[PDB]
């Protein structure tokens, strides 16, 4: 049929859409993780400490997530690919069953049991088996 171009769903505005379609609008949720903006006779500072604590905690959480992506291979983020083999013990389903018929919520409700082992494999594999390889490639 006819078309005019893409639209703007909004922040968190594709959580019910399909797996492929929600991977097109990853960019509008990365902005609002840090969000920004925000913007008597000086008796007490009771919400001059707590708002500031919330902002410091948000900055530290974003820095922790960026540091977690920095230890693993890339930091050219929002999508990249690595070299861990996907074992069939973690939710053995077909590609069309999880990439056409799923939201991301139903994906996390299945892979909520195996975040730590996947994180450890991504912690070790590309970060100690892609490194110490280029130094032998650059002999000449």
């Amino acid at each position, epitope marked *: *049929a*006819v*078309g*005019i171009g893409a*639209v703007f769903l*909004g922040f968190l505005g594709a959580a019910g859409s399909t797996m492929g379609a929600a991977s097109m609008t990853l960019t509008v949720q990365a902005r609002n993780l840090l969000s920004g903006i925000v913007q008597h006779l000086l008796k007490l500072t009771v919400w001059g400490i707590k708002q500031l604590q919330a902002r410091v905690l948000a900055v530290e959480r974003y820095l922790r997530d960026q540091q977690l992506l920095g230890i693993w291979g890339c930091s050219g983020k929002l999508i990249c690919c690595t070299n861990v083999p996907w074992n069939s013990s973690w939710s053995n389903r077909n590609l069309s069953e999880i990439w056409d018929n799923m939201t991301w919520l139903q994906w996390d409700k299945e892979i909520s049991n195996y975040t730590q082992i996947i994180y450890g494999l991504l912690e070790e594999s590309q970060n100690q088996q892609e490194k110490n390889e280029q130094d032998l490639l650059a002999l000449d």
Partner: nanobody, 119 residues
Framework: QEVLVQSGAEVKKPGASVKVSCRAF????????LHWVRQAPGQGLEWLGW????????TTSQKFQGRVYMTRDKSINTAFLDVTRLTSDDTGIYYC???????????????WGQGTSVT
């Protein structure tokens, strides 16, 4: 909950211009394209054109090219239809319609306004 609210009825002299408005309630306005469809009284549906509320890209049919304009405003979630150089054939009821817009193409018109009568 997904409704479109329209302006009141207008009566105009020939050769003038008419401006109608269409405001969205109950859905994210920047996510679905918007059509303008007219009905002369006692006859069928006639198409004018369609607008993206995000990018501002417009499309008018070639019979009404240079005569019918479509603008938008995201602050109040409203689209404006301007019809210039009026004759007596433009008298009728006008609808703004929401497209379902699945897979970056036109699919079907599911939400319609109450209509604006122009004479």
């Amino acid at each position: 909950q997904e409704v479109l609210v329209q302006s009141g009825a207008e009566v105009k002299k020939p050769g003038a211009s008419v401006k109608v408005s269409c405001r969205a309630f109950g859905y994210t306005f920047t996510g679905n394209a918007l059509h303008w469809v007219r009905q002369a009284p006692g006859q069928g549906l006639e198409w004018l054109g369609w607008i993206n509320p995000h990018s501002g890209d417009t499309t008018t049919s070639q019979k009404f090219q240079g005569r019918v304009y479509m603008t938008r405003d995201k602050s109040i979630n409203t689209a404006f239809l301007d019809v210039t150089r009026l004759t007596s054939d433009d008298t009728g009821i006008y609808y703004c319609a929401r497209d379902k817009y699945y897979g970056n193409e036109a699919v079907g018109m599911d939400v319609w306004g109450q209509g604006t009568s122009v004479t």
